[PDB]
Short mmCIF file of C-alpha atoms and ligand atoms in Angstrom, two decimals:
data_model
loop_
_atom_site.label_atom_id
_atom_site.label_comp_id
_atom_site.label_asym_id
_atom_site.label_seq_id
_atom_site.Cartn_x
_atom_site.Cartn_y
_atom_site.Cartn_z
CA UNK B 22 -19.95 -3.77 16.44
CA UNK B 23 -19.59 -0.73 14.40
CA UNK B 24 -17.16 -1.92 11.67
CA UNK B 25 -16.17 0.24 8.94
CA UNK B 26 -17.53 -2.36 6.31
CA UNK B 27 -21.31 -1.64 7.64
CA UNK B 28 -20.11 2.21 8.50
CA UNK B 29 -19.30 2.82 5.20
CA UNK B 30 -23.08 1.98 4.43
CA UNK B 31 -24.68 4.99 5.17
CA UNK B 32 -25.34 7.05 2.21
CA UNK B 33 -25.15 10.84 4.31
CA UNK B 34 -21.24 10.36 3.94
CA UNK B 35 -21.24 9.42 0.17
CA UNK B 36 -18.47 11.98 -0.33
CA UNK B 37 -19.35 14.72 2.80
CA UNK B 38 -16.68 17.37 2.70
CA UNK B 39 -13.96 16.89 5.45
CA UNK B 40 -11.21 19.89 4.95
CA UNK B 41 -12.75 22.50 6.06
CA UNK B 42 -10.38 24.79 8.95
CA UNK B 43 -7.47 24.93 10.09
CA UNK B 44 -4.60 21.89 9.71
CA UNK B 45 -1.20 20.75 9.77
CA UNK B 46 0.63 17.83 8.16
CA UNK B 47 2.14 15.55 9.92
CA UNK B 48 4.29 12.38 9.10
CA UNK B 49 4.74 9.10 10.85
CA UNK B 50 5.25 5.03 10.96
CA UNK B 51 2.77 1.99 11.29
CA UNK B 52 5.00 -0.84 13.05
CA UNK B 53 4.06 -4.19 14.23
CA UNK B 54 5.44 -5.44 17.89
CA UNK B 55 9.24 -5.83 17.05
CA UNK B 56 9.01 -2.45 15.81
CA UNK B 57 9.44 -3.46 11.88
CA UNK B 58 7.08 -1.83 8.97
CA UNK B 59 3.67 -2.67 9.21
CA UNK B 60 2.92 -3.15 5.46
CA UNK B 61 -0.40 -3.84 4.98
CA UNK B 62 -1.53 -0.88 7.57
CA UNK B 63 1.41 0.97 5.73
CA UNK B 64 -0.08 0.60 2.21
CA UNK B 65 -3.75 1.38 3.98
CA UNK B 66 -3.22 4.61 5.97
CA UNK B 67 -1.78 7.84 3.60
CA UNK B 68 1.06 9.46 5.09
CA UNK B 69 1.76 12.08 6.55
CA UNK B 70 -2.43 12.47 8.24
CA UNK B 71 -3.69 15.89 8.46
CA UNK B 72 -4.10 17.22 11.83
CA UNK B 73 -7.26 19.59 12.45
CA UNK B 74 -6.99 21.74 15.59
CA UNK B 75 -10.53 22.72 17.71
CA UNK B 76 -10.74 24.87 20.64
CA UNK B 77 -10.28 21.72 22.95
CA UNK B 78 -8.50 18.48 21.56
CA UNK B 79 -6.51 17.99 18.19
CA UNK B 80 -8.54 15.68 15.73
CA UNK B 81 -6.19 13.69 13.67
CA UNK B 82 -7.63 12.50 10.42
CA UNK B 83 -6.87 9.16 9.04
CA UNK B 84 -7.14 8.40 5.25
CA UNK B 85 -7.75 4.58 4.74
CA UNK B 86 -8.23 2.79 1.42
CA UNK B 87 -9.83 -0.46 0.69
CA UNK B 88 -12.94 0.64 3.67
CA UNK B 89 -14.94 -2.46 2.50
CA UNK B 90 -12.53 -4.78 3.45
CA UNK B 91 -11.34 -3.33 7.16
CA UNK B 92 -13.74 -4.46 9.46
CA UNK B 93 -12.03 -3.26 12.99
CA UNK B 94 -10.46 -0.57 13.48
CA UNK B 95 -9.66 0.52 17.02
CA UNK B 96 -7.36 3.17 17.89
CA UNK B 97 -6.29 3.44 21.62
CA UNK B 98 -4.36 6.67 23.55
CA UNK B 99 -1.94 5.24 26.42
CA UNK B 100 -4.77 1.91 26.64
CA UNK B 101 -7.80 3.80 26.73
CA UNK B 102 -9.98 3.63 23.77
CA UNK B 103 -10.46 6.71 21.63
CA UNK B 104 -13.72 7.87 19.86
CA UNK B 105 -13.20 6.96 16.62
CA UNK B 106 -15.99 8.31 14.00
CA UNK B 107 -16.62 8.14 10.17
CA UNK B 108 -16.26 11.87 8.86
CA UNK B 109 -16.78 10.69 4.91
CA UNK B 110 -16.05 8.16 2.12
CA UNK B 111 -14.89 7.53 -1.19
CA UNK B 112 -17.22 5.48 -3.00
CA UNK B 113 -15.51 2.61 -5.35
CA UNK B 114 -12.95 2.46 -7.13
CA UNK B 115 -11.64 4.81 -4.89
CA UNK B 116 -12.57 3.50 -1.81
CA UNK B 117 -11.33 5.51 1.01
CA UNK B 118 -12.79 5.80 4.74
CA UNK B 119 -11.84 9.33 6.28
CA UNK B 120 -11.98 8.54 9.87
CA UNK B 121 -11.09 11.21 13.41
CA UNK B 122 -10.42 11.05 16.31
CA UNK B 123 -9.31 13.54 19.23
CA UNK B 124 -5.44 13.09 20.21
CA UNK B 125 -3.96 14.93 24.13
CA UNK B 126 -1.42 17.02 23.77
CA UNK B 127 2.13 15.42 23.75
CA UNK B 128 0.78 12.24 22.45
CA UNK B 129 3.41 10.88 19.97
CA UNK B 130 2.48 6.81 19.63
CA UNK B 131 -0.94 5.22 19.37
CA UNK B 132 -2.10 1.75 19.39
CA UNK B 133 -4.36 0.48 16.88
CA UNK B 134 -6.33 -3.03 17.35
CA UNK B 135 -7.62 -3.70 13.63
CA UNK B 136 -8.57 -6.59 11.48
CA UNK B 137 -10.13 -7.55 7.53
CA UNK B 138 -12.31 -9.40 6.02
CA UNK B 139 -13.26 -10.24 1.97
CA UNK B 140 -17.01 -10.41 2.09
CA UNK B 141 -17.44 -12.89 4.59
CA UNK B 142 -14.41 -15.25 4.44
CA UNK B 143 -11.53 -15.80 6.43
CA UNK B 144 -10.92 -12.61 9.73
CA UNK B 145 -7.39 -11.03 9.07
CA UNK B 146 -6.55 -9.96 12.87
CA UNK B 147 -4.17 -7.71 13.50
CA UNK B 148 -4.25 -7.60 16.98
CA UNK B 149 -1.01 -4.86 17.55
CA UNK B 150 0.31 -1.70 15.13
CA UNK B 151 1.99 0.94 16.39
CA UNK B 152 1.44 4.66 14.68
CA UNK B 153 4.45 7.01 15.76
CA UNK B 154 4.03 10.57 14.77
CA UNK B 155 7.57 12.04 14.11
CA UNK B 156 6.48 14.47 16.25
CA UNK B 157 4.22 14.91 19.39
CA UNK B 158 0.77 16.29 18.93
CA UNK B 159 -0.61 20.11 19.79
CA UNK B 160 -3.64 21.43 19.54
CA UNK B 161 -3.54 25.41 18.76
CA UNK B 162 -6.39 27.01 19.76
CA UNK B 163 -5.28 30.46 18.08
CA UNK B 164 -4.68 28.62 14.56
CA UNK W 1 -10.81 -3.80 -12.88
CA UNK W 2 -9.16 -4.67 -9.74
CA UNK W 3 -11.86 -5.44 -6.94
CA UNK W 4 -11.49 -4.02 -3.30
CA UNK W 5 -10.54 -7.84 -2.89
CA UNK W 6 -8.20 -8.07 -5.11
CA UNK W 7 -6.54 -4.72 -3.75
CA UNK W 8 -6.99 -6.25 -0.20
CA UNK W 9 -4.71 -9.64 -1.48
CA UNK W 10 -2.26 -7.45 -3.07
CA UNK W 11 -1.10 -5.81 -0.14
CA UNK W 12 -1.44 -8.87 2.22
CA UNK W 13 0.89 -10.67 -0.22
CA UNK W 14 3.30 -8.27 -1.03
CA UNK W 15 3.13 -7.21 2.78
CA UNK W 16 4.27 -10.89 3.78
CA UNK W 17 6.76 -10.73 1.12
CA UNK W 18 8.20 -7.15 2.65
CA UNK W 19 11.90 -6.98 3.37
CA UNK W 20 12.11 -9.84 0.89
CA UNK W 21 10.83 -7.41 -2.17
CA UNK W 22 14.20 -6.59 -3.41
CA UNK W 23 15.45 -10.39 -3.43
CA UNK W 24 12.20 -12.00 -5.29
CA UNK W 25 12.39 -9.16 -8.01
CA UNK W 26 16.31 -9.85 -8.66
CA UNK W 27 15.90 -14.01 -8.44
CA UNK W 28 12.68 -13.04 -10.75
CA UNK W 29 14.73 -11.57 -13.33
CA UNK W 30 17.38 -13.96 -13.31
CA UNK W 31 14.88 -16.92 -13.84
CA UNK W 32 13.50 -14.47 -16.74
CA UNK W 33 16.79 -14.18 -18.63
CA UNK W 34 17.73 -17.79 -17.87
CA UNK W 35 14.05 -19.25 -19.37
CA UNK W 36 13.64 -16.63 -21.96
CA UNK W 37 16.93 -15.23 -24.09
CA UNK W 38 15.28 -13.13 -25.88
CA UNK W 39 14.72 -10.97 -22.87
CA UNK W 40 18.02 -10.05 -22.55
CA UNK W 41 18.27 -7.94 -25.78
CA UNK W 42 16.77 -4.67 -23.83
CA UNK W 43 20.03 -5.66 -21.75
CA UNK W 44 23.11 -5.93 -23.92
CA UNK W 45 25.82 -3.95 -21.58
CA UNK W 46 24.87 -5.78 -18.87
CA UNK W 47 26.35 -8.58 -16.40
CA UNK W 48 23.60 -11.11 -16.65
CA UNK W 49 25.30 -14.10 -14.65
CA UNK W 50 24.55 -16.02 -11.46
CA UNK W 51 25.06 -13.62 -8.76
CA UNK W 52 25.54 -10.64 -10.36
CA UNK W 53 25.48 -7.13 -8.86
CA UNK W 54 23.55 -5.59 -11.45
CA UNK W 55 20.46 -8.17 -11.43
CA UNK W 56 20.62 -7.68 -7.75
CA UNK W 57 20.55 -4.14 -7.72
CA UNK W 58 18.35 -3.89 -10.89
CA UNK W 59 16.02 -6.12 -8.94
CA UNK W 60 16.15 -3.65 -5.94
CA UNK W 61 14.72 -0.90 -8.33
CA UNK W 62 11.68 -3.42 -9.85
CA UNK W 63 10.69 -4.36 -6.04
CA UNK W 64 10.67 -0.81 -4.95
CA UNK W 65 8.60 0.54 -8.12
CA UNK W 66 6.27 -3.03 -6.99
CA UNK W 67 5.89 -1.16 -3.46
CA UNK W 68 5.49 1.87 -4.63
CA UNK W 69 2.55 0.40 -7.15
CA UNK W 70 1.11 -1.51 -4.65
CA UNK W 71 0.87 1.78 -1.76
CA UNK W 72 -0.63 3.35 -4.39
CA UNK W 73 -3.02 1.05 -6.28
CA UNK W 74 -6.69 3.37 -6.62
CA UNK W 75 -3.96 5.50 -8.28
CA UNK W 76 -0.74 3.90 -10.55
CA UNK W 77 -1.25 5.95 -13.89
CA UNK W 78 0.14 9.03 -11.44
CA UNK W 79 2.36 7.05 -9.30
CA UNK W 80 4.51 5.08 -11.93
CA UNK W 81 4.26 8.15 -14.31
CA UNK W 82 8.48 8.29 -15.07
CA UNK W 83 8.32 4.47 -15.79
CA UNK W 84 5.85 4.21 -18.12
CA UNK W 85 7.47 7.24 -19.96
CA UNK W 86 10.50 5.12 -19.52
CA UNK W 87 9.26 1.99 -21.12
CA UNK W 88 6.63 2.96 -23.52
CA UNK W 89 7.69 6.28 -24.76
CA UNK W 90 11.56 5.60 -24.73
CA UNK W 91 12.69 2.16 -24.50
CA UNK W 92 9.58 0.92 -26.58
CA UNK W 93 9.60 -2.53 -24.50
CA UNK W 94 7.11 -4.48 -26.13
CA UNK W 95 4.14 -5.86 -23.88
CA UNK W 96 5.21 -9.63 -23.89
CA UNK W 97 8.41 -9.56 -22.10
CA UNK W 98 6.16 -8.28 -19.18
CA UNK W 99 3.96 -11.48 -19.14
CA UNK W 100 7.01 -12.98 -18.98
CA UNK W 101 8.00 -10.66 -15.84
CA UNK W 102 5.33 -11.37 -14.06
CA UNK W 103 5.06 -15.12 -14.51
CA UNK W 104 8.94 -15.41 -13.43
CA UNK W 105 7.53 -13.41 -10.24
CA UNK W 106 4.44 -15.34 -9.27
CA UNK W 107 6.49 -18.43 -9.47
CA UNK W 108 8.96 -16.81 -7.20
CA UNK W 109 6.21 -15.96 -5.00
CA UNK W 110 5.00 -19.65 -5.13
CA UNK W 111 8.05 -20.90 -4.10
CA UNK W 112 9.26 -18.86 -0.85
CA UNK W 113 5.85 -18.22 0.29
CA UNK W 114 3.72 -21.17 -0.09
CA UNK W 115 0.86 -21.49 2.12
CA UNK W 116 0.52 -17.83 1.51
CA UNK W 117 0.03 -17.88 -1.94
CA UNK W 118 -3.72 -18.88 -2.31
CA UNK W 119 -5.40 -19.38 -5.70
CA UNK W 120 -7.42 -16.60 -4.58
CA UNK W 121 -4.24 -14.26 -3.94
CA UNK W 122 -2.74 -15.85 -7.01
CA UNK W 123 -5.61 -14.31 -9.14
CA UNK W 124 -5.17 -10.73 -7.53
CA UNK W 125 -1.26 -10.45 -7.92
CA UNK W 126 -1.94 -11.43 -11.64
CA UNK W 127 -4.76 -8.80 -12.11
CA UNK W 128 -2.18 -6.28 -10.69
CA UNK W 129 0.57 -7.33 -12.49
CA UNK W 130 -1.35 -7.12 -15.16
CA UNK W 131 -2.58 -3.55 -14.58
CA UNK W 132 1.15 -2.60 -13.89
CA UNK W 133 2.22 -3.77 -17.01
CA UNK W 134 -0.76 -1.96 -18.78
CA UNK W 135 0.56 1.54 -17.24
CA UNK W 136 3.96 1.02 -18.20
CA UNK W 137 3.46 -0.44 -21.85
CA UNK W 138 0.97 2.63 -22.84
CA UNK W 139 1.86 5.83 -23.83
CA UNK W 140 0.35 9.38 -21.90
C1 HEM M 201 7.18 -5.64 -13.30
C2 HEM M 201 7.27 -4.79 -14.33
C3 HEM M 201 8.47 -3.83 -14.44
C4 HEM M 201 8.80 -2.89 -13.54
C5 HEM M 201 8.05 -2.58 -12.24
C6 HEM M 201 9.99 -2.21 -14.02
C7 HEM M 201 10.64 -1.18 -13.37
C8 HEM M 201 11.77 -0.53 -13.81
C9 HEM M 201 12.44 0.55 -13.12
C10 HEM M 201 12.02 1.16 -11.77
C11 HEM M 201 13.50 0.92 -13.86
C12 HEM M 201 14.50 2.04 -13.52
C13 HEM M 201 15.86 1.45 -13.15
C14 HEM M 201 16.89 2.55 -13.07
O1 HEM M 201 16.56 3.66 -12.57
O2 HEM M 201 18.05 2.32 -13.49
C15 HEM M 201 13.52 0.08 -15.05
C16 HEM M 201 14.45 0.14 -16.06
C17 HEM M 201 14.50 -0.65 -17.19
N1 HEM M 201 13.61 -1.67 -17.53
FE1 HEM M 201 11.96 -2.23 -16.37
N2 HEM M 201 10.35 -2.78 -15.22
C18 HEM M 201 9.44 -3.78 -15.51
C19 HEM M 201 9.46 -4.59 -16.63
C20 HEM M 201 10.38 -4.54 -17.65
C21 HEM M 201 10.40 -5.39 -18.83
C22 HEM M 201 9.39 -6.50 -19.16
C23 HEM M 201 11.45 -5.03 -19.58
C24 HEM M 201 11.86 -5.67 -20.92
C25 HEM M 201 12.37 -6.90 -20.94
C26 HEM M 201 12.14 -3.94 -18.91
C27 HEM M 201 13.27 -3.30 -19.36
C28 HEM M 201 13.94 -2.27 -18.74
C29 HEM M 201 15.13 -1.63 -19.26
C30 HEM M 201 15.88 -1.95 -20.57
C31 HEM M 201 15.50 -0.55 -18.23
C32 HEM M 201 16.70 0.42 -18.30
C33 HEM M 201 17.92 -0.21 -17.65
C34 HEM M 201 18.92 0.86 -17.28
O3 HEM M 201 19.59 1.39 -18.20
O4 HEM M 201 19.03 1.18 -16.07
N3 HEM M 201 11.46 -3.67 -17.74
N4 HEM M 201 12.46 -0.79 -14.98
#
């Protein structure tokens, strides 16, 4: 159900610009439950994400390699599921699934639900990471 | 080269290996010097015994270049420029002894990590090795 294996698919985002307005870096850490590094998710996701303020809600923009592996990839605000949407891809050898999503303001930790698969083997879960910004998220309307 | 599979059992590995990086790549180099001598001429000033500081900090340094090859592998030309300057340009380390590297390390893999360390992971962390070795041994 809308896994970024099959999302990746769709030839409209075969390399569809994605850094256009305004942005701001910002760093943070993948952990599992005992709040230790995350590896695989921290070799996946580049650090620090850019941050792309709207007139509403900050969109944070995730960079994540290997897209034909991950298969889920849900990213939840305080438990409650966040729209989650393919804004472009880098074909291989590169790879890489640019995905958004809208963050609240003052949001500093999200949960993301995720799991892999190679072709159609063995499921990977990964059923708890942990991204901390190392600082809480604002939107700036005025830029 | 290296598949999006092969990328995907690189970081699963070395991401089960983790905290353990720094002691695999030490015991690694130990086994290399112990099973081949000939090694240890690119190392004459150094304390190559059982327990020795310098293999365990050395190995430190070879796990952390490992990480830092493995977070990021669509680019390690850029990422391990310095070392292959290092090796190629200045030490002039000739490509064998890293054959020899990396089958000290897959064995060390094989050994703490077992059920882990499929044949199908086994190919992938050769094919990176191998890749790794190919940055640092060429010249820019
Ligand atoms: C897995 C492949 C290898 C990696 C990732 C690697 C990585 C490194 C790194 C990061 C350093 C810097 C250490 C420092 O800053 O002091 C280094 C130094 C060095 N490496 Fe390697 N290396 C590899 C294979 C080899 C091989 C096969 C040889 C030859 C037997 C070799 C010989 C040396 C020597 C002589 C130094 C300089 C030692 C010093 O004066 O500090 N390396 N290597």
């Amino acid at each position: 159900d809308e896994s970024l294996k099959d999302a990746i698919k769709d030839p409209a985002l075969e390399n569809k610009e994605h850094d256009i307005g305004p942005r701001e870096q910002v760093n943070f850490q993948l952990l599992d439950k005992n709040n230790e590094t995350q590896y695989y998710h921290f070799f996946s996701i580049k650090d620090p994400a850019d941050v792309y303020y709207t007139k509403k809600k900050a969109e944070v923009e995730l960079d994540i390699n290997t897209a034909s592996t991950w298969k889920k990839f849900e990213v939840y605000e305080n438990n409650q599921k966040l729209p989650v949407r393919l804004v472009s891809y880098s074909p291989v050898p590169e790879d890489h699934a640019y995905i958004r999503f809208p963050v609240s303001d003052g949001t500093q930790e999200l949960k993301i639900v995720s799991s892999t698969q190679i072709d159609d083997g063995e499921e990977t879960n990964y059923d708890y990471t942990k991204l901390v910004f190392a600082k809480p998220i604002y939107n700036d309307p005025s830029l | 080269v290296l598949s999006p599979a092969d990328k995907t059992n690189v970081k699963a590995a070395w991401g089960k290996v983790g905290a353990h990086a720094g002691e695999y790549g030490a015991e690694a180099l130990e086994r290399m010097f112990l099973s081949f001598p000939t090694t240890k001429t690119y190392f004459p000033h150094f304390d190559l015994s059982h327990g020795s500081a310098q293999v365990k900090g050395h190995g430190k340094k070879v796990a952390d270049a490992l990480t830092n090859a493995v977070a990021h592998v669509d680019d390690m030309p850029n990422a391990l420029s310095a070392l292959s300057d290092l090796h190629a340009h200045k030490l002039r380390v000739d490509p064998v002894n890293f054959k020899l590297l990396s089958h000290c390390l897959l064995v060390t893999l094989a050994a703490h990590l077992p059920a882990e360390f499929t044949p199908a992971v086994h190919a992938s962390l050769d094919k990176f090795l191998a890749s790794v070795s190919t940055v640092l041994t060429s010249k820019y």
